[PDB]
Structure 1
Amino acid sequence: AFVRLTLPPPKVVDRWNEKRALFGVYDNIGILGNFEKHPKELIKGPVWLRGWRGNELQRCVRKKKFVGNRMFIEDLHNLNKRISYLYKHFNRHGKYR
């Protein structure tokens, strides 16, 4: 194989930037705040998987439910095919029955 003939540039991480310093604050907003807000409400992400977890087939179906009607034609077609592939895998294949 081949390896670099020079050392790559040093990578410097500032561990006291604002994002890292205050990471985690308000994770106990509920228990310490009279349960006004559940901590799951603080997650920033796709609408269909805020405060939710599942396997890919479940993830595929959940993406369709929330934004199935606002998706592009090609993206929706690929999602439908992705669901049908996963369905036959998880429900008809695998070592265990």
Structure 2
Amino acid sequence: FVRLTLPPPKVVDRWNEKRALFGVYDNIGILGNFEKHPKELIKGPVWLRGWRGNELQRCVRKKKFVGNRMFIEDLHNLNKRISYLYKHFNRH
């Protein structure tokens, strides 16, 4: 069934600092004499900063990067998940 009440009114500012300053320095490499590569500006998980791969590759790279810092429970779960993923992609 459907709502019988109106949702709260929402107004979004498209000129906020985050949106206004979005994309600045995206040309750092070409405009910065190539001292800093644009890949250096990527913020995210360490094992996938400036790198891309399939789900299996991402998990494997994650294991290598933080394997020494991973929990035993997480490490055991990752190994079990990897085994299932390995069989599916490499045999089916």
Does the alignment reach a TM-score above 0.5?
Answer: yes
Taking the aligned partners of 1:7 and 1:42, their CA distance within structure 2 comes to 42
Deviations, residues 8-55 of structure 1 (Å, cap 9, x unaligned)? 112221211111100000111001111001101101101001011111
Bigger shift: residues 23-32 or 12-21: 12-21
Q: CA RMSD in A?
A: 0.8
1:1-97 map, 5 Å: 2-93=1-92
C-alpha displacement at 1:89, in angstroms? 0.6
Distance 2:31 2:77 in 1: 45
Q: CA deviation at 1:90?
A: 0.4
Q: After the TM superposition, which segments of 4 or more aligned residues of structure 1 sit over 4 Å from their partners?
A: none
User: Quick one: percent identity of the two aligned structures?
Assistant: 100
Number of equivalent positions: 92
TM-score using structure 1 length: 0.90
In 2: Cα distance, 1:11 partner to 1:81 partner: 45
Instruction: Give the TM-score, by structure 2 length.
Output: 0.95
Deviates more, 1:82-91 or 1:6-15: 6-15
| 1:49-88 residue CA offsets vs partner (Å, 9 max, x unmatched) | 1011111100110001110110011111111111111100
